Structure formats: structure tokens, C-alpha cells
């Protein structure tokens, strides 16, 4: 009784951009994970720390589900100790974290003729992100000996750039929806728990 909302996160309609990943809290639930890894739609179901089949027996304090959309060739960056745009200037996972990473293709929903310019990603940043950070600032990236004063120009660029998702992009340049479940335990009781 009182199951967990794994339908408003996975089977939703519109996901967010990886520079504005959507976080959701889950507590006081009976979360049933077996329904997840008992499927073929999930092309990627990695799990760090915990084991997949041993998930309906633990009891964590709370769970954090981070949903977003990325390319197909950028999924290898969703993991501890990686490097690139996604991991550095966008969603960054800590080192030796406990949780699971799920990812599956969405070339049906997130593909448009002429390009879906609604999905964006941060390309420039003067430094790297700390783990679990969110920088939505659309400020101007300065790369020269000339201030930008909030005006795009020479060597002063815009950090957020669009994915050009089309339905003909073959495999690696196709949209992939990603959900990251972080199982955060604390010294407080274990509200979440598996079925019985």
C-alpha cells in the first residue's frame, strides 16, 4: 500500500534540459524497483554501490530522482569519475555515490523536423561544477581581453547551445532520457522501504 510515484518521473511527457535537471524527492513510500530492471526499454540500467536485484529489501532515508535529456554519446559521462561537458559544466555525480542510473531512447517524443531547439546544454563555463549543482545563469562567456557588458560579440559568447534533435539522426546523436536515483541515507529512520 502507498506505492512510490515512479510514473510521474519515468512515464512523464516532457523532461527537462540537462542544465536544468528536474529533481524530485521521494519518502514515506513502498517503492517497488523490480518493475524497473525487469524490462527491456531501459537500454542503460547501471547501479553503483547497490545491486539491482537486491533493491526490494533495503530501506533508505529518502530518494532523489533527477530527470533530464541528453545525447546518446553523452551517457557514458553519467558516472562517478568521468569528464566532459555533462559531468563538468552540467550534472556532476560525486565519487563513490550510492544509487542507480537509468537511460532509454526517446527519439519518438523528443524529435522534430527542423530540429528541436528547446533542449539545451551548457557549453562554456569558467570553472567546473561541484557535485549536485545547478547553474541556470545565462550570463555571457568572456574569452578575450575585452569586457562583454552583457552584449554578445567577438570572443564573448553564449554558453547555452541547443541540441539539434531530428528523427533522422542515427543512433549517437539521438535523444536519450535519463533518470538518476540517489539513495540518501541518514541517521533518521528509514521512511522508504521495499515491498514484502
Amino acid at each position, epitope marked *: 500500500t502507498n506505492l512510490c510515484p515512479f510514473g510521474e518521473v519515468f512515464n512523464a*511527457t*516532457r523532461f527537462a534540459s540537462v542544465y536544468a535537471w528536474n529533481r524530485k524527492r521521494i519518502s514515506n513510500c513502498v517503492a517497488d524497483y523490480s518493475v524497473l530492471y525487469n524490462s527491456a526499454s531501459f537500454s542503460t540500467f547501471k547501479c553503483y554501490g547497490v545491486s539491482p536485484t537486491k533493491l526490494n529489501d533495503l530501506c533508505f532515508t529518502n530518494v532523489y530522482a533527477d530527470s533530464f535529456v541528453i545525447r546518446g554519446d553523452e551517457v557514458r559521462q553519467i558516472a562517478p569519475g568521468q569528464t566532459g561537458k555533462i559531468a563538468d559544466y552540467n550534472y556532476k555525480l560525486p565519487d563513490d555515490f550510492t544509487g542507480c542510473v537509468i537511460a532509454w531512447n526517446s527519439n*519518438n*517524443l523528443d*524529435s*522534430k*523536423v527542423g530540429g*528541436n531547439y528547446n533542449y539545451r546544454y551548457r557549453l562554456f563555463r569558467k570553472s567546473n561544477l561541484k557535485p549536485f549543482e545547478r547553474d541556470i545563469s545565462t550570463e555571457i562567456y568572456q574569452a578575450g581581453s575585452k569586457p562583454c557588458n552583457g552584449v554578445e560579440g567577438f570572443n564573448c559568447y553564449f554558453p547555452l547551445q541547443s541540441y539539434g534533435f531530428q528523427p533522422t539522426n542515427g543512433v549517437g546523436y539521438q535523444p536519450y532520457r535519463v533518470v538518476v536515483l540517489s539513495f540518501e541515507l541518514l541517521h533518521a529512520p528509514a521512511t522508504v522501504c521495499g515491498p514484502k
Partner: antibody, heavy 121, light 108 residues
Framework: EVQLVESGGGVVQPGRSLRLSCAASGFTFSSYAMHWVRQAPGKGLEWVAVISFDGSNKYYADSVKGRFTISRDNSKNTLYLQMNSLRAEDTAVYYC??????????????WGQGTTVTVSS | DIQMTQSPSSVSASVGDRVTITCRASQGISSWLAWYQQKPGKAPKLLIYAASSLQSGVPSRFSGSGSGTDFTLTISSLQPEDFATYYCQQANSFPFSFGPGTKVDIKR
């Protein structure tokens, strides 16, 4: 030129089934998603179903779930809607609609003149 | 299932007059509302998407604004080819939903 033409409009009695078919001409059918939308006599537009550009993602309303089944065939450039267990609450005029994107991030932009559907014994 | 209401239930207007039509929802759709136009004995004709954009081949007298749970469409200078019925459509989640409709009559 872009042109959608629907067919399958005629009398039919309750309980029985029917199949409507839309034919497209003048654009890449195998990329755009398709919508089925009805309008009852004397009432407003109502959403019926949507299908993607490959046939793996289908969505229906809360009044035609299970009863209706949408599908397509890119070979002949055809879009099919199979209605089963018809009722008198379904006499309407059905329209096919094009969509550059599933979820209609930009809206429908191509429609057909429509096909009528009468349901009475 | 989000329900999309319109207002007013009907409108009487004249040529050149400025017409406004409001649309409301029950939940929060950021900007995913489109506006269709239907005439007696024809098919709809998309006008506005994203609640602020505009479809090619559409005059500029049609304007759209709003966000969240309140949207509005505006016709600055009406013309004889604008007396029709106007529907709203949300696209935030499935299943979608239209509006009951808002007619535009003629004044006398």
C-alpha cells in the same frame, strides 16, 4: 502540395467495429507524427489519439482507451484508426492532423476536410 | 486530465474593433497553448503556438500572450474573414484537451 484525405465514413450499428484510413501526399510521412481528432454534431473539437513517426509510441484519450487502436503504414503512406465497440456517443466528424513533433511542441499545421461517422441501428 | 476552459462563452463585435479572448486551465502549463480557428463547414486553421509565437501565412493582427494558468488571444483590427470559432489546446501532458469554444458574432 500537402494534402491529407480521410475515408471510412458511413453508417454503422453499435457494438460493431470500423476502420478509418487517412492518405497523405506532399511530404515525408515517415517523419511527422499524426493525430486523430473528432468533432461531434453541434459541439466542439475533441482529441482522440496520437501516434509517432515509427509506431512505437501511441496515446489515446480516457474515453477511447481499449476501444480504439491507432496505427500507420509508411509504405503506402497511410494512417489507420480501428474503432471497436462503437456507441451512439461517437457519431462525429473525424479529422487527421499533422504534427512536426510528438507532444505538439509547435502545434498541428495540416488538417483534412474530415469524414463523417453516423452510429445508429 | 487537465481541463481547459475559455471565456467569454460568446462575443459580438464589429470590423476594426479590438477583440480579446481568455483561456484558463486547472494546472500549470508553462507555455504550451495553441489557438485554432474553425469556420462552419470547414476544418481548423492553426494560428498561435507556444502562446506567443505565430504560424507562417498568418496576418499580424493575431496576437497571443500569457503563461501559467492564464492565456489570452487578441485581434487588433477584425476583418470579415475572422468571424469564426476559436479553440485552445494544451500540450503539457497526456491526454491533451481542447476548449469548449468561443464564438465571434457580428454586431447590429
Amino acid at each position: 502540395e500537402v494534402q491529407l484525405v480521410e475515408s471510412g465514413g458511413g453508417v454503422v450499428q453499435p457494438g460493431r467495429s470500423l476502420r478509418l484510413s487517412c492518405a497523405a501526399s506532399g511530404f515525408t510521412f515517415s517523419s511527422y507524427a499524426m493525430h486523430w481528432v473528432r468533432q461531434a454534431p453541434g459541439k466542439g473539437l475533441e482529441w482522440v489519439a496520437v501516434i509517432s513517426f515509427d509506431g512505437s509510441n501511441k496515446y489515446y484519450a480516457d474515453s477511447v482507451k481499449g476501444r480504439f487502436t491507432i496505427s500507420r503504414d509508411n509504405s503506402k503512406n497511410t494512417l489507420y484508426l480501428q474503432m471497436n465497440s462503437l456507441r451512439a456517443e461517437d457519431t462525429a466528424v473525424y479529422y487527421c492532423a499533422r504534427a512536426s513533433i510528438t507532444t505538439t511542441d509547435d502545434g498541428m499545421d495540416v488538417w483534412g476536410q474530415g469524414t463523417t461517422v453516423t452510429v445508429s441501428s | 486530465d487537465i481541463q481547459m476552459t475559455q471565456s467569454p462563452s460568446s462575443v459580438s463585435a464589429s470590423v476594426g474593433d479590438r477583440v480579446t479572448i481568455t483561456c484558463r486551465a486547472s494546472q500549470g502549463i508553462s507555455s504550451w497553448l495553441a489557438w485554432y480557428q474553425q469556420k462552419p463547414g470547414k476544418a481548423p486553421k492553426l494560428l498561435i503556438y507556444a502562446a506567443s509565437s505565430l504560424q507562417s501565412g498568418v496576418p499580424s493582427r493575431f496576437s497571443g500572450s500569457g503563461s501559467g494558468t492564464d492565456f489570452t488571444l487578441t485581434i487588433s483590427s477584425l476583418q470579415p474573414e475572422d468571424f469564426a470559432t476559436y479553440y485552445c489546446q494544451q500540450a503539457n501532458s497526456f491526454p491533451f484537451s481542447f476548449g469548449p469554444g468561443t464564438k465571434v458574432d457580428i454586431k447590429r
